[PDB]
Symmetry: D2
Subunit: 259 residues, 4 copies
């Protein structure tokens, strides 16, 4: 049996076979986890139901984390089949597209800031609030961050602030929920060509740069991220909580490799 | 003094205890000309009195919850200072019920929204509204706290909002550097100001810090004021995007209390 | 088969059943790795040979990392049975005991500094130099650090500087060896009652403090560290290099939990 | 100036390009009295000339490889300054063959030993030898580089030695804080001094930094000098154990060159 046997894990954020959440789901399934899936809106319904069935799952529930009621209804439905479960993968990041091009100070707005932080940071702890009493001891929560939290990256703009808020959220959630038996961590992934790359100019040349200066001399895949994610939601990682694990091939720890 | 010739807007003076009050005094002592904002009609009279005591006549209302308030303020400011040399952002707020008890239970969507809006977005909101008024060589400063970087009991959603604010420092420094503007923060140690109002065990916390801080005291608004004046002066020309810890070394020690 | 099948990993630093290296070895063995072991001096010979046999291993070699010749001879012997292999666990830390009590500036000496850095930092890259041509693509190197690298901890003294040197060593080794297919990481472990706790005053009260303020409300074990270590030397962690992973239950990411 | 009344020992002046030369000039300009050390007989005449130009007569040999040299120096210094207010450590060295090529191939046990001995241990060696001579309010300063925190090509074992040095800053600040002594570092951006001698592609590196640094220039010894003077002055009373980046914001940006 895999190292996720006996675990029930909810996975958010599967939008396509390219999604980081899809790679996480595949690895967790390979390691024996029973999975449940959410989807943002009705456009993704049929599609996520198909990915879920491939991964042994009947449990496919609508959840728009902009709305407290949607989160509450989704966990009420999940509780009909999983009265308790062992944690969830938060793989949800969003800012209005106009925020992510151009000079940051000119591009950012109060509303773009509000949405980026609400959807990409608040929603992680919103989900934890709503399922807190359903978690078993040994449970693990996981979210996905990016180096733009720690460094100023061109065009990433207000998403960098939202990810910095999210990484702090990881620490405060880990500190609050640890005593009752829940761990909370993040993977800071290197850039991956997913739907989150849509309309981001210079994304090809950006991946080429990472490929050149990353110590392992390739960019990471959703399979790399999936394997680390399965570890971090498994009991193998029982000694890790509140941690942001860089799964970017070492990109963040080198400088001036370009020359 | 080493701010002679600079014109610096100071937000956030609420009482003689305020961090911004200590910053303004230090900056005045080093020769800056100062302008002041006040949040609301409750605070106007105090800020006018303090401003007058530092030789300033420029006291303008600004509630950073409202874009129009920030715009109107900088329009008024431009009648007397068509250009100036930066501003001190000393504004932090979350609804008080956010700052008591288990973080996951206390946080709400609205408390989160407000904390991030008032404590983080307002810094770049201000920079947006005065960007064309900044001289080359200008400096912007904000105040952060160790709760950005570590989980501190009861600081709760303010820690996320400060983490957003420190990233804002980096993004703003990266964006405005090429125009000649630096952006930095001070991560101050705890100080008993109005920001301690209603906070559980604040005195026990200060006693802890005073015992484990390397300099064996907690910091004052004089200590923060002196570092702020440096970070807004041309002496710090080599420093941008930085969060400077002005906490007596508290953050760099561990298990000091065994 | 376990997630370390087809891997050959050399393990340094087993001194007793309490050693962090012993917990790492047990987990790697459980996950299907073939192991080889070193021992510092002849006092540990019989004992390490016994731990190794329990873990399926005939390969037990002397190695004192103070001496380049000892490291070279040991890898020449290892190459008779493992012409190539897949990485090693560096679990070796030492400073003269007088360095680790009292005010740091009064306790530290040039010689105590020299030894602490030589044995606890240089030896990691010494070992990599000496076996570089024996590593397969996919190989992984791992060392053990401690929070005293990042924070000033009473009495840890010059070992804090040596661990900071070691964590930088992790980054420079990862950057140099990544392109040929080798990853290099560290675990920063929370405190564990091992022989490395010998003669450290206040170690009981220190563990009690960690137990109280760690988010998971217990101190970590060599089994926690072993499971993370097996992950970091496995292909599951193919996207991680140059990283210092905190396996301390979240201790480092909280502050003022005491109150 | 803001160092009036302070007496500061400055190590590491080797040429007008040295970081320590810029520090000494800034400190003199702010009113400190200065004393100087020189490594060896080769450097004596230059350091005496520079010292005389800054009104100092206190020029003492000190090779931090030797405990007796440090002791003898502080014995000599105590004949004129029985107490003083801290020192600037601006000393970094690895054998040059360590600083070229693949790190794992270039590093050796002896090159490692020397880099850590001269660049890191010597800072606490100096503090040990003058500890009883430091006034309350004293400040110690050293110079680090981003290679402590990130793997930089060719910087090689100097990056480990700087990481050891920054931990030394923390441990020294923690140990000496309660006596009234602060200890900090400046992590300076690259500067073309004698420390660039023989270094591969140093000019290409500076061009890179000047393109991606937020302030769009590399830093000068004037920039570092001004920050050093602040960190050794009572204006920085709230700051100890800190590594202050004086690199124009270079370290806080990423992928700026796309
Ligand atoms: N792709 C990268 O380069 C990269 C690198 C590091 C981190 N990340 C982060 O990884 C996570 C997954 O992104 P991805 O790259 O897999 O792209 P993706 O577009 O496939 O996944 C993003 C998902 O967020 C979901 N989502 C957005 N708003 C939502 C809402 N209101 N309610 C519910 N769900 C909502 C979307 O439906 C989608 O399933 C994001 O947080 C992203 O910021 C991406
Ligand atoms: N006191 C500490 O321990 C401490 C330590 C580190 C950082 N900080 C931060 O320093 C800053 C100044 O806090 P303080 O300790 O001086 O307390 P304070 O209460 O004196 O000052 C906070 C100021 O924020 C202003 N403000 C709040 N909401 C506003 C709004 N919508 N528009 C305009 N102004 C608004 C208030 O009027 C007040 O002037 C805050 O950002 C605080 O988070 C405080
Ligand atoms: N025990 C803790 O609290 C803790 C926490 C974090 C990190 N660490 C680090 O974990 C690693 C393992 O320590 P441990 O706690 O398992 O204690 P241990 O005493 O069981 O292991 C230390 C090992 O280092 C070996 N060693 C020392 N000098 C050597 C030399 N010259 N040549 C070859 N080997 C030598 C010793 O023989 C011993 O096997 C060390 O690096 C330690 O600093 C320990
Ligand atoms: N130039 C840069 O790009 C840069 C950037 C950041 C930090 N640094 C660091 O700043 C410091 C000053 O370097 P610099 O750029 O001014 O170059 P420099 O060559 O002018 O100064 C280095 C000084 O170290 C002294 N020194 C070397 N070995 C010594 C010994 N055994 N005893 C006494 N003194 C010894 C030398 O005599 C010289 O005065 C070094 O620590 C350097 O690592 C340099
Ligand atoms: C790398 C990198 C990424 C990927 N990544 C780490 C993310 O977190 C991407 C979040 C992201 C959030 N909101 C978005 C979009 C993307 C665009 C699609 C559409 N969904 C949209 O309207 N809004 O995005 C970048 C943006 C600018 C610069 C660099 C990057
Ligand atoms: C230290 C420390 C501080 C001071 N400090 C760093 C801050 O940033 C304090 C921001 C803060 C924001 N909003 C607040 C208040 C304070 C309380 C008064 C009233 N103004 C209120 O309703 N809302 O506050 C803490 C709160 C909990 C635990 C520790 C601390
Ligand atoms: C925690 C903690 C540890 C454990 N730990 C993380 C280590 O890395 C311990 C390394 C260590 C190195 N050298 C030592 C010894 C230990 C003592 C046994 C004997 N082997 C000796 O002569 N020299 O040690 C501490 C020392 C002081 C304060 C706190 C701690
Ligand atoms: C930047 C940068 C620097 C400058 N700098 C931050 C330093 O700390 C430079 C220390 C340094 C230590 N020892 C040295 C030398 C220099 C060379 C001259 C001679 N003095 C020598 O034999 N030994 O050096 C680099 C070396 C490689 C790559 C990048 C850099």
């Amino acid at each position: 049996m895999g190292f996720l046997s006996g675990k029930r894990i909810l996975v958010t954020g599967v939008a396509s076979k390219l999604s980081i959440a899809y790679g996480i789901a595949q690895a967790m399934h390979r390691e024996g986890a029973e999975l449940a899936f959410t989807y943002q809106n009705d456009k993704l319904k049929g599609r996520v139901e198909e990915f879920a069935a491939q991964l042994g799952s009947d449990i496919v529930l609508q959840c728009d984390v902009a709305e407290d009621a949607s989160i509450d209804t989704m966990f009420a439905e999940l509780g009909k089949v999983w009265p308790k479960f062992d944690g969830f993968v938060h793989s949800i990041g969003f800012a209005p597209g106009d925020q992510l091009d151009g000079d940051y100070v000119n591009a950012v707005t109060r509303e773009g800031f509000k949405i980026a932080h609400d959807i990409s940071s608040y929603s992680f702890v919103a989900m934890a609030k709503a399922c807190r009493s359903m978690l078993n001891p040994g449970s693990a929560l996981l979210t996905l961050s990016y180096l733009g939290a720690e460094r100023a990256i061109p065009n990433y703009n207000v998403m960098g602030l939202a990810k910095a808020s999210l990484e702090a959220n990881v620490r405060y959630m880990a500190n609050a929920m640890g005593p009752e038996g829940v761990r909370v961590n993040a993977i800071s992934a290197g850039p991956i060509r997913t739907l989150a790359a849509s309309g981001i100019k210079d994304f090809r040349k950006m991946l080429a740069h990472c490929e050149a200066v990353t110590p392992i001399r390739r960019t990471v895949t959703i399979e790399d991220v999936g394997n680390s994610a399965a570890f971090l939601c498994s009991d193998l990682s029982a000694g890790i909580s509140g941690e942001v694990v860089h799964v970017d091939g070492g990109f963040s720890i080198a400088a001036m490799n370009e020359l």
